[PDB]
């Protein structure tokens, strides 16, 4: 079986099942009819199942590529969902295994049914008590030889649903290069630069999906509702997508503040298999030689975020991704206009502390030892969490923060208040983020190294 | 008071005290005479004390330099020892503070006497029971406003004595660029390349101090006793110094195996304030795609060495020094020929596990989870310790190991056992180390960044 | 099936397999021929498998003996290797179970093939890339009801190989009574005393295997190369075996310094099932009443060695072995002349701290609390590790150190230098060790008590 073929059979099998389930649900709602246990066992509501096998013998196996490789020989499977949405990805990946390793592809009904909530397309239903009880009782609901991908069908559906809700955007609009910001003024500056890019008939950016719904293209009456204030009341983490023809745009998510939030957003955004996400936000400068408006390139993190300690113990080393570091570095060199060791007067590379206690100042003395011990240089509340999640989900990551204040030196200024020197840098900052992406996008596959491959790393990127 | 002046008064005061103490000791040994408590209180046996003050007001204070800076205004002091040995360093540092900040230097007797063992230039002079007791009873012994430097007089003397003993070399011969190796064959290759360098009338290398005593210069009968086998029985960590006129040579120390050793050696070598030390040794490849002879550039460490957990908790992040990473990377590009992106076929950049349990294989199962969790790529027994010590003592560090075997893939091999493919690269490996040093030496001050500065970082480098 | 019979069938089955594998390997090397999977399944490369069963009903079951007992009724099995080497041991053990319990012995091919490295007798192979790859791919490699013995076939082969490498000696020369030393001068004194013993036609000692190869017997031209300095460069832990007719000699291993090393050596030496190993080395005296040259009989250990914390938690109690303690005690009484309670002026029995941080002095204040809390009396770097390993592998153990300096009292000496009084003591010390062994050897089986038996203690000693 071949790539293109596999995709079609996936498309087919999937549509078939979702349609079959929707039908079953309606038939129950209207007449109270139940599905026949036999057709289900036969794979009525089941997700398609994609399997790739390798005999383990190829003359020149790619050993440098970061993804799309085989560690050993055998069969790798996984359930599939939204084949259309993932068509690009699925093809790119299957092709690599098909050609480079000459793998045996095959598609067929899995043993996992699609939870009914994931097939109810229009507005969520509003059945009475009994009606609901009956649904969750007679229909597929959510429950609490080697993996072919990182997430299985159910995990992906679960996250796709959330991404929409939190983001206030369609999962189809997300771009491969992500930018995370903890300050509202960053979106403002992003949207503005965005629309600008659309009108420029040279900028590949041809559209702008906005948290809330607004779709903005070259010909759009009043490009004002782009930042419909109502967004920040309906969506905990609004997103904005500067889309391009080939879908190599830039997606920006304003994760807001709290490690709790940074973990949550990444847990879902991860299923879309991004190429890289960058933390572009404000932070506190801990060194006296730092001036508000300066930049910090995180090269390590003191994880006082707690949110990921369970799944990733604090003594597990979270490294810097060289490729992402250079991009962030050079981007600062170019955008800030000063080439050479000149940048060091505006950029400090060092260890960043991420914490879940915003009023950490109230306990400085207690923190001070660890702060010194780790040669901390700045402090924030998302960095380490974003990095850690990138590390966990194999998504290149990087952190470039802008000093918005110096807690340890009288100058405490809560973002939103008058802080000339910080505020005036918000635009340049966002630009360093964007340029870093440009640089990384041009890197092609170089972007991805083997730095995050686990021993059991799935063949799919 | 000025730099040159301060240095001379230090020289003076020091010589005076050591001589005064040697005298006191002889006078006791010969006649049983004791020193007069009054002259001691006056500063008879005391070390000189160097003090630098800053009023805290300079128009353009260096804020980018990594060392020789002032965080705040005030008086910084420290006891001084072996002023002659540290003449170069002491001058370079005092000068920076004198000029750039216009600091007020001053020298004067401290309140700390020199332990008598540090002044007995002679290995020994046989004293019986009572003679000894009398000595430790009536003479200075080792009894377990801001800091100007990292180590005080006693701490330095302590380490200098050891460095000699462990190394089998004179502390005066140590060079600013250090190479650490865990395999005897590395020294062989180093010595050979060294002598060759001396004979070449273009290679700045004009001498070769050898563990044991042998001093080798351009005109030396038989440059054979260079590796006097007796060294490895008298010195737990033999050193070899390829000295140059200006003292910018290369020092190589064969730390042998065990984290216990790596810590010990660094504790002492640190007082000589090196410019960078590199871990050039063997390791086990944990990834299937690795081949014996390949290289590993550590970009993080899983610290299972235990030896430093007390003074530096495992959750404290130890980063990579960008400058050192590039040098190690580029050096591998150049030396292994075939540069560019082909290097990735021979060099893997990833996390290295350092452990104190050599037979860790006997417990693989237990380790496996953490190995996977940390995306480990290789395993050794010094890396993380050397790195962590560099981190602690503010000495740029880097690790570039060579896969000598693959424990997880039927190929457990021992350093001594026949390993055709590892042995073959030992020369090329050492060359990558040396080239990286060359590259870093040429970096001038660029080598030193602010990545290791603590909040209370001492003015002196 | 009977003892002698079982040993022969083991001998047979083993030789057969190793020969068959060697043949297979050659056939591959020369023609590229592969073994037939069928013959392998049949047990072509497999180790013999020794099984003993007990119906669980004997009138007077030995309940006092320390080893060779049955906890419950059932079948106890294990793979066997080098039957010839273990002939003595294997017989002695199988006999005890055969007679005392009337057990049913049986031998037969196991399910475990012998890793090819263990059958290549001469020197390790040096095949090219492909040749090696092919070997590890098509042949047995090292991959990472109740047990009859402590270690199975593979584990034993693994350690036998290492013992040779680290020790620089043939596993067949190892004697039942072991001495561990952390100072080179101990071997010197041992060798000297050894040759002396050989020449004396009353001393059972008739030979001396030396680390490096040198075999010394009564008629050996120049007994000088006994301590071939080259040993300490090729062997991380040289051994010397004072052999006797009946193999009840004394083996001395210079484990050098570091807990990492002590663990490693015991991991392997353990498979030879020694009768007892003693830690005879130097240490630091922590009590002012102690004088350099004094002895310390460890009766407990503060485990700051970290190296065994994983496998044996620090709160698990490591006791003293009464039998070994008496021997060590009396040996000090006899050898030091001082009889009765006079010994207490030269020997202090107390708790010893073992650490992996050699420059622990640099942190005294932090240690001091625990030191006091544990009534510490001396400090070293192997004791607790050797003791713990003995405890782990059921090998009676004991520690008798010699004070080589007093860190806490102005004499932070560096053993490997000019410490007059410690040097003098060495010979007497080594003699106490040797006398203790004599005493224990005479103890016959008394030596072994039930103090180390686990609940599942294997039948074999």
């Amino acid at each position: 079986l071949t790539p293109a073929q596999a995709l079609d059979k996936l498309d087919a099998l999937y549509e078939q099942s979702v349609v079959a389930l929707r039908n079953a649900i309606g038939n129950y709602i209207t007449s109270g009819e139940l599905p026949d246990e036999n057709a289900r066992k036969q794979g009525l509501f089941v997700y398609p199942s994609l399997t790739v096998t390798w005999d383990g013998s190829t003359t020149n196996p790619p050993k440098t590529r970061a993804f799309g490789r085989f560690t050993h020989a055998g069969s790798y499977t996984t359930t599939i969902t939204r084949p259309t949405l993932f068509r690009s990805y699925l093809n790119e990946q299957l092709t690599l295994l098909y050609q480079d390793y000459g793998a045996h592809i095959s598609v067929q009904p899995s043993q996992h049914e699609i939870p009914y909530p994931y097939v109810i397309d229009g507005s969520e239903l509003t059945l009475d008590r009994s009606m609901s009880a009956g649904l969750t009782r007679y229909f597929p609901t959510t429950e609490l030889f080697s993996p072919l991908s990182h997430f299985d069908a159910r995990r992906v559906d679960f996250s796709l649903a959330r991404l929409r809700h939190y983001t206030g955007t369609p999962v189809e609009h997300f771009q491969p290069f992500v930018l995370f910001t903890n300050y509202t003024r960053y979106v403002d500056e992003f949207v503005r630069w965005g629309c600008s890019q659309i009108l420029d008939p040279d900028s590949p950016y041809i559209a702008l999906s906005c948290a809330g719904g607004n779709w903005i293209t070259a010909e759009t009456e009043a490009p004002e509702e782009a930042i419909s204030d109502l967004a920040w009341k309906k969506h905990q983490m609004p997103a904005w997508h500067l889309i391009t023809a080939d879908g190599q745009g830039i997606t920006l998510v304003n994760i807001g503040v709290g490690p709790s939030n940074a973990k949550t957003i990444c847990d879902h955004l991860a299923v879309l298999r991004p190429d890289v996400w960058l933390m572009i936000g404000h932070c506190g400068g801990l060194r006296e030689s730092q001036a508000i408006g300066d930049y910090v390139l995180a090269h390590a993190y003191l994880r006082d975020d707690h949110v990921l300690d369970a799944v990733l113990p604090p003594d597990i080393p979270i490294p810097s991704i060289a490729e992402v570091q250079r991009a962030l570095y050079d981007a600062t060199k170019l955008v800030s206009g000063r080439p050479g060791e000149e940048v060091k007067q505006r950029l400090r590379t060092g260890t960043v502390v991420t914490t879940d206690d915003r009023n950490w100042e109230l306990r400085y003395s207690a923190s001070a030892l660890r702060f010194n011990l780790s040669r901390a240089v700045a402090i924030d509340m998302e960095s380490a969490t974003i990095a850690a999640q990138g590390y966990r989900f194999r998504v290149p990551y990087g952190t470039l923060l802008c000093v918005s204040d110096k807690p340890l030196h009288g100058e405490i200024k809560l973002p939103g208040q008058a802080n000339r020197f910080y505020e005036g840098a918000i635009s340049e900052h966002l630009q360093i983020g964007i340029r870093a992406i440009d640089l990384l996008r041009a890197e092609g596959d170089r972007l991805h190294s083997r730095k995050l491959r686990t021993f059991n790393e799935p063949p799919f990127r």
Side-chain angles (χ1 to χ4, degrees), chain A:
Chain A
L1 187 34
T2 76
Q5 298 185 71
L7 290 169
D8 293 323
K9 186 173 182 178
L10 283 175
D11 271 302
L13 271 167
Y14 185 60
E15 317 298 354
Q16 224 181 305
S17 292
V18 35
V19 167
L21 210 201
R22 279 167 174 166
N23 204 65
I25 295 175
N27 293 32
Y28 175 80
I29 297 185
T30 67
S31 60
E33 176 192 357
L34 281 49
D36 72 305
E37 298 310 305
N38 194 67
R40 297 183 70 176
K41 290 296 298 298
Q42 191 55 40
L44 214 195
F45 303 154
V46 158
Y47 290 88
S49 180
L50 174 53
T51 307
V52 178
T53 306
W54 187 52
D55 54 306
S57 69
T58 294
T59 44
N60 56 307
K63 292 302 178 67
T64 286
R65 189 164 46 182
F67 54 81
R69 297 215 287 115
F70 279 117
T71 281
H72 54 74
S75 292
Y76 303 78
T77 194
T78 184
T79 47
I80 293 287
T81 191
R82 312 281 246 90
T84 294
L85 170 57
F86 292 98
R87 153 81 65 168
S88 327
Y89 174 75
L90 281 179
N91 183 54
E92 180 213 356
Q93 301 303 311
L94 282 175
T95 297
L96 290 173
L97 302 173
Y98 187 62
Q99 312 192 320
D100 294 293
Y101 289 84
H104 182 58
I105 305 175
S106 76
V107 181
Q108 63 287 303
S110 73
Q111 293 299 118
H112 306 285
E113 301 189 298
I114 307 179
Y116 81 76
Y118 300 132
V119 300
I120 290 174
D121 195 69
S123 179
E124 311 90 311
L125 292 180
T126 300
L127 284 60
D128 65 81
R129 294 291 182 180
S130 298
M131 273 305 284
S132 294
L135 260 185
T136 58
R137 169 171 181 163
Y138 301 107
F139 292 96
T141 98
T142 36
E143 282 315 290
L144 302 306
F145 219 136
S146 289
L148 174 54
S149 61
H150 299 269
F151 309 100
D152 78 304
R154 274 211 193 64
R155 171 59 200 268
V156 174
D157 272 348
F158 173 83
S159 292
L160 288 185
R162 270 70 181 168
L163 248 195
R164 195 162 172 56
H165 177 76
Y166 293 131
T167 269
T169 271
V171 298
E172 310 90 57
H173 299 163
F174 283 66
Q175 303 300 296
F177 310 79
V178 180
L179 242 42
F180 290 126
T181 58
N182 49 21
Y183 188 26
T184 165
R185 276 224 53 216
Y186 278 100
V187 312
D188 294 331
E189 208 61 59
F190 180 66
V191 178
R192 178 200 140 292
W193 173 82
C195 299
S196 162
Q197 292 308 102
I198 293 178
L199 276 22
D200 173 355
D202 303 298
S203 191
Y205 304 109
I206 78 190
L208 184 75
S209 185
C210 299
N214 277 55
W215 171 272
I216 294 177
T217 174
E219 55 264 54
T220 300
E221 343 51 73
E224 277 56 66
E225 302 69 14
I227 302 182
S228 171
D229 279 8
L230 183 53
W232 277 282
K233 178 185 171 179
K234 298 176 172 180
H235 307 121
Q236 308 170 55
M237 292 145 283
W240 279 274
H241 316 280
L242 234 208
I243 312 166
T244 79
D246 47 330
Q248 299 301 287
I250 294 186
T251 284
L252 176 139
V253 182
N254 181 57
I255 61 187
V257 164
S260 324
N261 256 205
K263 176 185 174 295
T264 297
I265 195 62
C266 290
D267 270 338
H268 308 301
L269 188 46
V271 311
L272 293 177
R273 306 274 64 213
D275 279 296
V276 62
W277 50 52
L278 271 25
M279 182 61 235
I280 297 299
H282 66 71
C283 73
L286 305 171
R287 295 318 181 86
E288 80 68 37
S289 51
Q290 287 173 138
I292 293 188
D294 283 355
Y295 297 115
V296 181
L297 175 65
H299 82 339
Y301 306 89
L302 178 63
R303 279 141 63 53
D304 287 355
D305 55 9
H306 312 300
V307 76
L308 283 174
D309 291 13
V311 303
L312 188 62
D315 65 314
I316 297 307
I318 305 303
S320 310
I321 310 315
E323 307 73 50
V324 184
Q325 294 286 282
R326 297 178 218 121
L328 261 356
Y329 196 70
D330 300 338
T332 306
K333 258 182 175 175
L334 312 183
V335 181
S336 96
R338 279 125 76 278
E341 93 257 301
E342 204 176 9
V343 283
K344 294 220 175 300
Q345 290 178 294
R346 186 71 175 298
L347 173 75
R348 173 64 163 279
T349 306
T351 289
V352 178
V353 185
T354 290
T355 175
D356 65 354
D357 173 19
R358 172 135 45 170
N359 299 314
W360 61 274
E361 300 97 325
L362 297 184
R363 290 180 65 248
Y364 185 45
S365 55
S367 309
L369 175 61
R370 288 166 66 65
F371 275 35
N372 201 212
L373 224 35
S374 55
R375 314 294 193 275
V377 103
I379 178 164
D380 83 301
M381 304 180 67
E382 287 85 34
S383 297
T385 308
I386 292 313
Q389 291 288 67
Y391 176 91
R392 288 225 303 153
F393 303 125
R394 290 78 152 188
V395 180
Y397 52 82
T399 289
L400 187 88
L401 313 177
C402 186
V403 184
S404 77
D405 68 286
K406 305 178 62 57
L408 272 31
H409 309 78
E411 288 180 295
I412 310 191
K413 293 156 188 170
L414 332 162
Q417 301 171 182
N419 180 23
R420 221 163 94 314
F421 288 97
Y422 169 56
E423 284 291 329
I426 289 206
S427 180
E428 184 184 8
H429 195 192
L430 180 55
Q431 282 310 306
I432 301 180
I434 301 173
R435 180 65 74 90
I437 287 185
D438 284 353
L439 278 171
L440 289 172
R441 191 198 296 97
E443 284 258 77
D445 279 33
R446 246 68 180 308
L447 165 53
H448 293 79
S449 52
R450 298 168 290 185
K451 309 198 212 300
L452 306 174
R453 287 184 65 74
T454 54
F455 290 80
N456 40 30
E457 193 60 43
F460 283 4
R461 180 180 64 72

